[PDB]
From a paper:
Protective antigen (PA) is an element of the protein toxin secreted by B. anthracis. It is a key component of recombinant Anthrax vaccines, since the immune response against this virulence factor confers protection against B. anthracis infection. The structure of PA reveals four domains. Domain 1 (grey) contains two calcium-binding sites and the furin cleavage site required for proteolytic activation of the molecule.
However, recombinantly PA (rPA) stored in aqueous solution is aggregation-prone. TANGO detects several APRs in the amino acid sequence of the protein. It was experimentally demonstrated that the solvent exposed APR (APR1) in domain 3 is the key determinant of rPA aggregation in vitro. Therefore, even though analysis suggests improvements are possible for all three APRs, we focused on APR1 (N573IYTVLD579). The MASS plot identified position Thr576 as a suitable design hot spot, allowing for mutation to Glu, Lys and Arg. An additional in silico mutation screen using FoldX revealed the stability of the T576E mutant could be improved by 1.2 kcal mol−1 by a compensatory mutation S559L. The mutant side chains were well defined in the electron density and superposed well with the predicted side-chain conformations by FoldX, further validating our approach. Far and near UV circular dichroism spectroscopy (CD) and near UV confirmed conservation of the structure between T576E/S559L and WT. Moveover, whereas WT shows characteristic signals of aggregation in the plot from 50 °C upwards, the T576E/S559L mutant starts aggregating only at a higher temperature, suggesting we have removed the APR responsible for aggregation during storage at room temperature. Plotting aggregation versus degree of unfolding, it appears the aggregation onset for WT occurs at 53% of the unfolding transition, whereas for the mutant aggregation only initiates at 84% of the unfolding transition. This is consistent with our design, in which we reduced the aggregation propensity of the strongest and most exposed APR by the T576E mutation, delaying aggregation until more advanced denaturation when the remaining APRs eventually become solvent exposed and initiate aggregation. Taken together, our data indicate that mutant T576E/S559L displays a lower aggregation propensity than the WT protein, while conservating both structure and biological activity of the PA protein.
Author numbering: 14 to 163, 169 to 276, 287 to 303, 320 to 339, 343 to 735
The structure:
Amino acid sequence: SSSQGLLGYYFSDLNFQAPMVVTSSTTGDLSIPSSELENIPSENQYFQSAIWSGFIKVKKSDEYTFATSADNHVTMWVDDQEVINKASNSNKIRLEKGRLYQIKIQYQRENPTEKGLDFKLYWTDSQNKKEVISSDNLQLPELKQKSSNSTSAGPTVPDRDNDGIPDSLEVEGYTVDVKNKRTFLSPWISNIHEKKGLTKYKSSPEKWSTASDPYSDFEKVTGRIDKNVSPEARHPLVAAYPIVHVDMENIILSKNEDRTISKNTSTSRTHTSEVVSAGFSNSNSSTVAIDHSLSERTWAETMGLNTADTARLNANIRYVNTGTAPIYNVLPTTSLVLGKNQTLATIKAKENQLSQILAPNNYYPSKNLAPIALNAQDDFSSTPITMNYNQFLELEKTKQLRLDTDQVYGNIATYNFENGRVRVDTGSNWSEVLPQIQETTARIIFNGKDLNLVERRIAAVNPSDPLETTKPDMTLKEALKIAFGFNEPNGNLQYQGKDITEFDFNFDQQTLQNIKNQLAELNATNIYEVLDKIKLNAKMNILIRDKRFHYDRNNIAVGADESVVKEAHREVINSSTEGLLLNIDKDIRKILSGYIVEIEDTEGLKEVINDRYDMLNISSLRQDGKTFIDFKKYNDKLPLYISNPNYKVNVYAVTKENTIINPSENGDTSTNGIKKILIFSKKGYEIG
Ligand SMILES: [Ca+2]
Ligand SMILES: [Ca+2]
């Protein structure tokens, strides 16, 4: 436990005013060699005062004499009783086993001749055995949030919220740097720390956790935190909390009786806009699209499902955490919903019986393991998921399901100062924390990574709330850098090489009005030029999306402009009568449902090879990540027959938003009404 010990505050001044280093020491050796002070101006490497705080506990009752390597400069209290005061002494104090004695030490030396501090806390037993106090006998002060209803003995570091960071540092700015076995927390000094690659922190001196999450500002920056918490959420202004949805991977529909439809499904976590404007809702939901492709006639007929029959549904799922904190003992409950509000099933996992962690940016079960079946194989008491005839017709019509997941996440792994360890705390519940996170942060949702919606929350002021006014200012620019890792190599804001102007900015109706007001005040008509001047407030909702795609009402990417789709297919690696091989970006493939292949004769007449709405699925991804478009799949497994070399092979792309998933009113099953985009056209002789 390299984080346990006494907590020390080292000041350059004589009167505990200018804290230069805040760090813990594991043993009674409270020294800081000048060698580990390279992030401190040499001039300020002289410590004229210091304060240490914590507890001492003993594992064998005895009478003890405390001594220090500089008693003449030390005043020391044990449970508010003064035991050393500017003179060495041999007074004994009885220390009882299994008790916690509060320790406080102050040190003052004017104008020391050495940089740093050489200082040790000793004790002597009843056997006259004197030694530097061991790591086993020391523990940190309890830097947890106090109660509403929460003397002296010496100097007090102003620390209104009891996180451990002095009020002045949180307000004016601080940083941390790891030297060997320790993390030194120091005031921000621009002329040293910028070119050392250090991060400048500010936080609220009134909020134990500035993001209102369950990890203290001090715990976050000193690494006294769950290792599974996302690295961006180690910043005191970025909230650390789980965000869980269910991903359905495939589905099997069957008729209930004493022939089946088995289809892959694609599932996306959603964010439902209002009317144009981002939504206010913080609920977890995902929408499932069932593959409409060919396996003949309707599913219902294939299953032999008639008016008085019932259909059964089974599926494989995983839980996905797209948040910034892990989950340990409770997976959230999920409703499987048909249409608007027809609940087909309640999906639950057993409380306190998780087989593994559900970590940020990860899955439950993990990808190397089998997914969860809604009705497991040997689980014969599991409730079947059934639907009547009408309900099944509705399912075949929409081929869509919804998964509404609650926000019940179980207990939190928190740091324990008693033993200097992170452990699951049974008295801490994510439900006791989420509402405050949601109430005190601005939310940004960004899809730049892979077009999936990723949500982050950033501590921001509430100008109506006195406590939330004590927070550091937060610009839109800074939030994007700290929460999402946007950067700016030459002062130009980017996300992973991509210019900021490539992304659209959308807000809820309240946030929009706020932003427009700020723009008018800045005499700006464009948000890009003033991203570093736009201020965020608590409860803003900001949606940021790649401009190259079309989005549905759930803000899922479902298409792109014709030119974007065409350009994406310009890179043909190989063409033959068997198919096309080409490089297609991941993001473009995400918005395509498949392709239509046609042969056009010299007269301009056409033969469509795969002429069914449910025959678009002729594209596959190779191991090397290239896309193969298979001409043979729906051509009776034969290469195209091109009767004359001057005939053309035309291949069209179909985007998700233009995909037809059922025959038309009149029973048309062809591709004739499908809105399609030409992406390849070559003559027989050009193909070879
Ligand atoms: Ca504080
Ligand atoms: Ca704080």
